Every structure is written in C-alpha cells, then in structure tokens.
C-alpha cells in the first residue's frame, strides 16, 4: 500500500535521475582529451626513507609549508617529521595504540588523531611550556574514527564507523553539525579548496558531497561497486577522484553529477587504499594493495609511472601543497619521499 | 628523544598482543578472570577485546594483522548459534590480512554442554546430520569418570572446527583447540604454551628448519 508505493516512487525517482544523467552524457571525456599529447613516463626516486616507526602506519598529512609531516602508527605514536632533514620534530605517545587517522592543522598549531577508541584527540604543538599535551578529547561517536580534517583552528570535520560524519567545534567540544545518510562505514573524507563543501566515501559503494553550513547531503554519486577507501578533490575543486576495493579509480564531477573516467587495468586485482592529486591535477597518484603505487594520467586514464620500494601494503599517500614531492607510508613502518 | 623511543621499542617488543574474539554469551571475559594485561613466566600478554563497534567487522579487523594470536572463544553448549560461530571462524581463518595469525580456540562451557546432552531435550543430529555418522577419535584422552557421550559430542565439535581449520593452508598458521569449563585457572598457562608453540614455529620457519 503506502510502503509499496514508497519504494515504487523511489524507484521511479532513481530511474528519472539515471535518465537525466544519461541525457547529460552527450560525449565522453576520454575522446575530448585525445588531441593533447600524452604525459609520457614519469620517473621518481626515493629521495628520503623515513625510519623510526615501530608498527604499521595508517595516516599522514602534509603541512601547509610543504616541509612538516605527521604520521600515525599502531605502536601508539604520532610522529611529526621534518622532511628536509629527516629529523623527528615531535613524537607523542597515544593513550590508545589503535589509531587509524591523523590530521595536521593549516596553521600548524594543532594535530588530530582517532581510531578504535571512538574518540578524536586534538594535541597542541605550540604550548608555552614547550611540551605537547592532549589539548582536547572529543567524544560522542559510536563507531571508529576513519578520517579527520581541520577546517581551521576552531572546527574540525571527522568521519566515524557509525556511518556518520561530524563537524565539531574545538572551543565548544560538542558536535556542531551531524551528517547522516551513508549506509556503510565512512572511510575517508576530503576538504574542498573553497572550504564550503566536502565529500565523503563509505562502504556502500557511494560518495556523498555535503555542505558544511547546510549540514545536508547536497549531492550523491553511485559509480563504484565495492567499498570506498579513499577520496580527494581535484585541485580546481569541481571534481574528485575516488578509490575503491574493486581495483578501480573513478573521477566524478560535481557539476556533471556522474562519472568522468575510470582508471583500471586487467592485471590489477588489488583494491585502492589511498588516492591523491598533483598540483595541477594532471597526475593522479593511487596506492594499491600490491605493495606499489601507480601514477596515472588524469586526462588519458593510462598509467604513467610506478612507485615501488614498499614490501608491505601501502596505507597512506600525500602530495605537498606546492607539489614539490609526494610522501607514501606503508604497513612496513617506513615512509618514502618521491620527487 | 631517541633514547625514549628505544625504551618504547624495547617495551613494545617485550609484550605480546592478542585479539579476543567471541560472540555474546560465549563467556570470553570469564576465560582469564576494554583491555586486559597479564604476566606468565615473566612475559607480558596484552589482550584486546573490541566490543564498542558495530557489526561491520570487515574494516577495523585489519588493525589486528600483527597480533600474536586470536583467542577465539566459542560456546559449545548452544547447538543453535554453533553455525554462526563456525561461519565467523571460517571468515577469520580465510582472511587475506589474517592468514598469518594463529587462532587459539576455546570451547567454553563444557559443563553446560554436558547437562544439555544428558538431558536429551535437544539432539545434535537435528542440527548436524553428520553427527550420527561420527565416531570418537582413538587419540582422544578422556577424563577419569567421564561419560563417553559428552566426550563424543565435544570431540565432534572440535573435529567440526578442525575441518574448517584444515580446509585452508595450515603451514602459514595453525589452530590450537582447547576445552574450557565455566571457571579455569589454567587458561593463562594454555595461552602461554600456545604462544610458545606459535613463536617457535615462526622462528623455525625463519631458520628454514620446518
């Protein structure tokens, strides 16, 4: 009756959305970019091999100065590195060794953590006493914290294992905004350059674009067929790349409201773990479970480079704000800088 | 800053991490008595029991690919949920990221199984049709004054778990089944001995002696 009509009308809405998207797909992006010359082979060397972590590393985040770095390991350590001199700027033990995410504030005065403890820990690095202490302990999530990004020094956006995202205020300490709608576990999120919008990928094979102020799911993309592990905006801010467990990467455009390109190969059967974009967005870097990273041409959907040297699964990947170098951390307790 | 990291590395390598996995009413907390620490023969074992997450165990379980062992506690008295326990054990055993971690199986509440099987209200044959075509293993060692029926049922359950364990490769990791009553003070000793065996096997594999 009413409920059957509810599913019927939802199905017809989905069909209408699919028809509209198909109508908007007048031409493919791959054929339009055929005219430009290929990027060619990309060669990168391991400039630095960062050592000192005990267990597997999950998260890293480059600083705004493109020199400081942060990493989180299962031994219970959050280490802030100086990439230029390979010196440990800071090394903070964690109350819970089960940490799966970390963040670095744009101002550089704060860092973030979070993991199986269901709690996001914010640490201050500019204490008057010159000792890093737990600045705040944000709690209220009923699932493990998978990603966290600092909007500013006052508010932070996190994603939890309870299929929800939360915008917290550091001064208040409470959930300023709650984003719900994801069916599967939310695994990663990215902040758009305009700071107004942000995408989130979950274990429902779908991505959702949310507005920070509105607090509602502005847009939804359903192109993947497996769990989504990573997401990152294009530098222009009008597109984003998503990596999933189905060994494919997909580029979506906010205005196009559908897929643009798919990056995959027959010999690849390992799911994506981390994705990132270059400074100009021409090169898309993707970590893989086959112990190596792949650099694809974002405009031709062909592999342009292979980054090898990790003997364990690559977990985190990050490109500097100026695009000078890219840092890759794997489950081998080592970080490698490539340029 | 480096000396503190060296001490942290020493203490981290000194202790051995275990992952406690068990459904409700199995009695996982009673095995030793959300983290617990104990010391046996001057070596420290830290057991982690995750219970604050949802039923989606696909993702966060990847955090436990470096633990020494997985203490899998299963209730052998409830002939109904047994199938769910077998499915969970098979999923844990056949995991891509848990293929190198040994599993120590604890059949908790053997006594309740005893009263249930002597009661006669519930028969294993109804839920396990292959129990009728089963015989007690020759190598099985029963207790003094111990009923053949209860040992037959418990060894049938143990062999049913061992079939799943041996279906996949056993060279990379092994399963150690044990019988646990309602309360036991030898659980820590059994865990210590099984960890001894696991680490010795890993050392021999590194030595190419096995």
């Amino acid at each position, epitope marked *: 009756s009413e409920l059957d009509q509810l599913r019927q009308e939802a199905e017809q809405l*989905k069909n209408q959305i699919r028809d509209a998207r198909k109508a908007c797909a007048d031409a493919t992006l791959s054929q339009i970019t055929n005219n430009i010359d290929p990027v060619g082979r990309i060669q990168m060397r391991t400039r630095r091999t960062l050592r000192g972590h005990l267990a597997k590393i999950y998260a890293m985040h480059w600083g705004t100065d493109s020199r400081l770095l942060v990493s989180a390991s299962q031994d219970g350590k959050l280490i802030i590195w100086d990439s230029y001199t390979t010196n440990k700027v800071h090394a903070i033990p964690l109350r819970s060794s089960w940490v799966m995410t970390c963040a670095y504030a744009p101002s550089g005065n704060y860092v973030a953590c979070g993991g199986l403890d269901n709690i996001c820990s914010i640490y201050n690095l500019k204490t008057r006493e010159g000792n890093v202490r737990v600045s705040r302990e944000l709690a209220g999530h009923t699932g493990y914290l998978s990603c966290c990004r600092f909007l500013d020094d006052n508010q932070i956006v996190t994603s939890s294992g309870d*299929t929800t995202c939360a915008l917290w205020d550091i001064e208040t300490g409470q959930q300023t905004t709650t984003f719900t709608g994801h*069916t*599967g576990d939310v695994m990663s999120l990215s902040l758009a350059p305009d700071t107004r919008l942000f995408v989130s990928g979950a*274990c*429902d*094979a*779908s991505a959702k674009l949310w507005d920070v102020r509105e607090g509602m799911c502005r847009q939804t993309f*359903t192109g993947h*067929e*497996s*769990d989504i592990n990573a997401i990152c905006f294009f530098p222009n801010g009008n597109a984003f790349a998503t990596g999933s*467990d*189905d*060994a494919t990467c997909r580029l979506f455009d906010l205005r196009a409201d559908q897929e643009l390109m798919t990056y995959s190969h027959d010999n690849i*059967i390992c*799911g994506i773990t981390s994705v990132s974009f270059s400074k100009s967005g021409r090169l898309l870097l993707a970590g893989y479970d086959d112990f190596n990273c792949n650099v694809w041409d974002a405009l031709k959907a062909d592999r342009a480079g292979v980054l090898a040297g990790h003997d364990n699964r690559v977990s985190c990947l990050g490109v500097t704000d100026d695009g000078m170098a890219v840092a890759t951390g794997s489950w081998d307790s080592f970080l490698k800088i490539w340029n | 800053i480096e000396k503190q990291l060296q001490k942290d590395k020493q203490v981290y390598r000194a202790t051995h991490r275990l992952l406690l996995l068990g459904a409700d009413n199995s009695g996982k907390s009673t095995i030793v008595k959300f983290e617990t620490k104990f010391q046996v023969d001057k070596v420290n074992f830290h057991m982690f029991d995750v219970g604050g997450q*949802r*039923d*989606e*165990r*696909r993702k966060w379980i990847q955090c436990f690919n470096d633990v020494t062992a997985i203490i899998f506690v299963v209730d052998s008295s409830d002939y109904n949920r047994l*199938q*769910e326990a077998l*499915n969970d054990f*098979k*999923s*844990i*055993w*056949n*995991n*891509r990221w848990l293929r190198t971690i040994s599993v120590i199986l604890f059949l908790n509440k053997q006594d309740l199984l005893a009263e249930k099987v002597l009661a006669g209200k519930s028969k294993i044959e109804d*839920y*396990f*049709p*292959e129990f009728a075509r089963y015989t007690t293993p020759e190598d099985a060692t029963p207790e003094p004054g111990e009923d053949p029926r209860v040992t037959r049922a418990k060894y049938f359950i143990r062999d049913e778990f061992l079939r799943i364990s041996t279906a*996949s490769g056993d060279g990379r990791h092994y399963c150690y089944p044990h019988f646990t009553c309602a309360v036991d003070t030898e659980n820590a000793r059994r865990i210590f001995n099984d960890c001894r065996d696991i680490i010795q096997r890993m050392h021999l594999r590194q030595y190419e002696l096995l």
Partner: nanobody, 128 residues
C-alpha cells in the same frame, strides 16, 4: 549502482518445491562470491548457503545440507536457489547477498539489517 533483486517464493505447500531467483546489476557477477541468507520471524540473520565465483566451491548450512541446491549463471548474471521438501522451519525472508571483496574466499554478509550489498529478499511461507 549495485542492485540485487529477489524474485519467487510466497506460500508453498509443505514438502513441495520452490525456486528463488536473484538478478544482479551494477557489477560483474562472475568476480564475486554469492550467498543466500535467511531471516526467520523474531530471529536474526543466518547464512544458509553460498556459492563461489566459478561454482566449483558450494557450501550449505547443516539444516539444508543436500536438501537445497544453489547455482549461478554468469552469462546473464543470475543466481538460483532451488528448495525441495519445504518444512515449517523454512518460513523466512531470503536475501541474495553479494559480499564486497572480490577474488577472496571469505566475506561478511550476515550483518544485522545494516548491509548495502544485500537485496530486499522474498518471503517464503508454508500452509498450515
């Protein structure tokens, strides 16, 4: 988008035969292991059958071993579950679940009503 539509079932005489079909779209059916899970009224989800990618490996729960059969057709991306000699304990909602990890042996699809890769299911009941 991943879609798993279940068809068939309904009211059947005890001891009869029934056929359940599962149509899969949005993904390659041959690259994933398929499962059939039943939920009884007032009871949680339980796994009742599973079939591997190529169909070489097929397993059933103890309550249906031999009694039921499962098959897959990758040419038109379909799953079939044939049930013979229905019993009153078989009155349940059946779900065709495509577990997420491809090219893997294990997978989790018995989660409590929170699973994006499971169909709506069909009701199977026996006449009194």
């Amino acid at each position: 988008q991943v879609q798993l539509q279940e068809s068939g079932g309904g009211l059947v005489q005890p001891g009869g035969s029934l056929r359940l079909s599962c149509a899969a779209s949005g993904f390659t059916f041959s690259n994933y292991k398929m499962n059939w899970v039943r939920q009884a009224p007032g009871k949680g989800l339980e796994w009742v059958s599973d079939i591997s990618q190529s169909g070489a490996s097929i397993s059933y729960t103890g309550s249906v071993k031999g009694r039921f059969t499962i098959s897959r057709d990758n040419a038109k991306n379909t799953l079939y579950l044939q049930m013979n000699s229905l019993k009153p304990e078989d009155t349940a909602v059946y779900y065709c679940a495509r577990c997420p990890a491809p090219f893997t042996r294990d997978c989790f699809d018995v989660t409590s009503t929170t699973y994006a890769y499971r169909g709506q299911g069909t009701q199977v009941t026996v006449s009194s």
